Structure 1
Amino acid sequence: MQVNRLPFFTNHFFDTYLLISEDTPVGSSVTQLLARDMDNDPLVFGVPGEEASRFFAVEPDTGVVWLRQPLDRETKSEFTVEFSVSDHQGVITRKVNIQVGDVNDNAPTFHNQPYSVRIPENTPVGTPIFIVNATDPDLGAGGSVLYSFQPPSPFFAIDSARGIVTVIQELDYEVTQAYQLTVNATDQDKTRPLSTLANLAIIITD
C-alpha cells in the first residue's frame, strides 16, 4: 500500500509576488493556481480565511483566481493571501504577497478652503498675496499637482508648482472692486490627467 502524498503548488509567483492593477474589472481572472500530486489525484482549489476571500474567488477545479470586488490601492495597497489545494484527503495552503498596482484614479483635493483675501489697491506688481495648496494620493505623475487660473488673469498669476499667487498688473478700485477667479489644480498623468476647481475671491480695498 502507498500512503497518500499531499499535493504541492508549482507557481513561481509564490517565490516572489503577484501584481494586480487596481483597475482590474470585477469578474476578471488575475491568475491560475497550479499544482501536482504524485498519486495523480484530481485537485480542488480554494481561498480560505475571511479577508482574502472577500476580494478573491477561485474556480475549484481549474485554479483560475478571479476578482470578487474592486481593488483600491489608495484604500489597501497589498494583501497576503493564502491559497489552498486539496486531493480530498488533506489540504495544503501557501501564502503570496499581492501588490496592488496604481492607476491615476483620483483628482486633487484643495486645502484650507474657502479662499478669499482682501488686498489694497496700491499692492505693488510682484507682490505675493495668497498661497493655494492641493494634494493628490495617486503615485508618480498622477500625484504631482500643477496650479493655474482658468482662464489666466491679466492682473494675477499663479506659480504652477508652488501655488503662489502674485499681482502682475497695477490694480484700480474704480474699475473692479472684486475678482472671482477659478483655480485649477491638475495632476500630470500622461493619458488620463484629472483635475479639480476652487474659487478664489480677491477683494480690492481702497
Structure 2
Amino acid sequence: QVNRLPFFTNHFFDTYLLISEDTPVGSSVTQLLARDMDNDPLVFGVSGEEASRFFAVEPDTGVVWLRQPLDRETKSEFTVEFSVSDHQGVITRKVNIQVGGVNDNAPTFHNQPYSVRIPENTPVGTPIFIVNATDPDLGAGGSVLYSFQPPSPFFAIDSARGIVTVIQELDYEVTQAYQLTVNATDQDKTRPLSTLANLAIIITDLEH
C-alpha cells in the first residue's frame, strides 16, 4: 500500500556508457531499465540543461535517443542524470558517457592566403615559408602530413614540419611566379581526410 520508489537496474550506472561521435541523431544509445516493487507503471527522463540538449528519453519505454550530434572535439565526457518516476516520486542517477572518437576532421590551414616573394638567387636548401594545418582528431587521424600536389621540381615541403625549401636553382626569365598547391592530410591508415591550400611563390630580380 505505501508506495515503494522505483530504482534503476542497468549495469552501466556502475560503469559507463560509450557513444561514438558519428552516431547519427535519432539513434537509440541505450534503454533505461528500472524496477518497482509495487509494479507501478514508470516514466523515464533525463535531467539537466546540457544532458537534455544532447539526449532525449522515451517516457514509457525508457529508450534513450541522441538529440544533438556528439562532437568529441568539443565535449568528450558527459555526466547525465537519468530519472525514473512512479508518479509518486522521482528517483535520479548519474551515468558517465564517454564520447568515442572518429576521424571526422579534415586538416585546416592557418594564416592563409599563402604568398612569398623571394629573389632568384635564393640558394638551393633555403627555407622560404612555413605552412601550418591543424587537425583536432585523435591519433593518426589528427597527425598531419604535408606534400606538394602535384610535386614541384623547384620546391620541397617537409612532410612533418611543413617547411617549404628551394631544391633547384631558380631562373626569373623562365618562371617569375609559381602557383603550387599544398596537400595536408591526416594519417588515418584506412580513411584519411585532406585539404588543399595554394602557395604563391613569386620570384624577384632586382639586378635586371
TM range (shorter): over 0.9
Matched residue of 1:47: which SS?
Answer: strand
Provide the C-alpha distance between the structure 2 equivalents of 1:51 and 1:128, rounded to a whole number of angstroms: 48
Higher mean alpha-carbon deviation, 89-98 vs 114-123, is at 114-123
Deviation at residue 192 of structure 1 after TM alignment: 2.4
Higher mean alpha-carbon deviation, 67-76 vs 31-40, is at 67-76
Provide the C-alpha distance between the structure 1 equivalents of 2:13 and 2:66, rounded to a whole number of angstroms: 18
Provide the C-alpha distance between the structure 2 equivalents of 1:49 and 1:146, rounded to a whole number of angstroms: 41
Provide the C-alpha distance between the structure 2 equivalents of 1:146 and 1:134, rounded to a whole number of angstroms: 9
Match of 1:67 in 2: 66
Higher mean alpha-carbon deviation, 117-126 vs 89-98, is at 117-126
Provide the C-alpha distance between the structure 2 equivalents of 1:50 and 1:177, rounded to a whole number of angstroms: 59
Provide the C-alpha distance between the structure 1 equivalents of 2:187 and 2:61, rounded to a whole number of angstroms: 42
Provide the C-alpha distance between the structure 1 equivalents of 2:86 and 2:152, rounded to a whole number of angstroms: 72
TM-score (norm: length of structure 2): 0.93
Match of 2:29 in 1: 30
> Cα deviation per residue 1:137-188 (whole Å; 9 max; x = unaligned)?
1111111111011100011011101111111111111111110100111111
Matched residue of 2:39: which SS?
Answer: coil
Provide the C-alpha distance between the structure 2 equivalents of 1:113 and 1:59, rounded to a whole number of angstroms: 47
Matched residue of 2:47: which SS?
Answer: coil
Provide the C-alpha distance between the structure 2 equivalents of 1:51 and 1:203, rounded to a whole number of angstroms: 51
* Identity of matched residues, %: 99
Provide the C-alpha distance between the structure 2 equivalents of 1:124 and 1:98, rounded to a whole number of angstroms: 56
Match of 1:92 in 2: 91
> Cα deviation per residue 1:125-146 (whole Å; 9 max; x = unaligned)?
1221111111111111111111
Pairwise mapping of residues 38-187 of structure 1 onto structure 2 (< 5 A)? 38-187=37-186
Provide the C-alpha distance between the structure 1 equivalents of 2:30 and 2:190, rounded to a whole number of angstroms: 27
Provide the C-alpha distance between the structure 1 equivalents of 2:189 and 2:11, rounded to a whole number of angstroms: 33
Higher mean alpha-carbon deviation, 132-141 vs 188-197, is at 188-197
Provide the C-alpha distance between the structure 2 equivalents of 1:49 and 1:143, rounded to a whole number of angstroms: 32
Deviation at residue 51 of structure 1 after TM alignment: 2.1
Deviation at residue 86 of structure 1 after TM alignment: 1.3
Deviation at residue 89 of structure 1 after TM alignment: 1.6
Matched residue of 1:51: which SS?
Answer: helix
Deviation at residue 111 of structure 1 after TM alignment: 1.8
Question: Which consecutive residues of structure 2, in runs of 5 or more, have no partner in the other structure?
Answer: none
Total equivalences in the alignment: 205
Provide the C-alpha distance between the structure 1 equivalents of 2:56 and 2:166, rounded to a whole number of angstroms: 58
> Cα deviation per residue 1:49-83 (whole Å; 9 max; x = unaligned)?
32211221112222111112222222322221111
Provide the C-alpha distance between the structure 2 equivalents of 1:163 and 1:113, rounded to a whole number of angstroms: 14
Question: Which consecutive residues of structure 1, in runs of 5 or more, have no partner in the other structure?
Answer: none
Provide the C-alpha distance between the structure 2 equivalents of 1:122 and 1:59, rounded to a whole number of angstroms: 71
RMSD: 1.4
Provide the C-alpha distance between the structure 1 equivalents of 2:21 and 2:187, rounded to a whole number of angstroms: 19
Provide the C-alpha distance between the structure 2 equivalents of 1:43 and 1:152, rounded to a whole number of angstroms: 65
Deviation at residue 93 of structure 1 after TM alignment: 0.4
Deviation at residue 121 of structure 1 after TM alignment: 1.4
Deviation at residue 101 of structure 1 after TM alignment: 1.5
Provide the C-alpha distance between the structure 1 equivalents of 2:32 and 2:98, rounded to a whole number of angstroms: 17
Deviation at residue 88 of structure 1 after TM alignment: 2.1
TM-score (norm: length of structure 1): 0.93
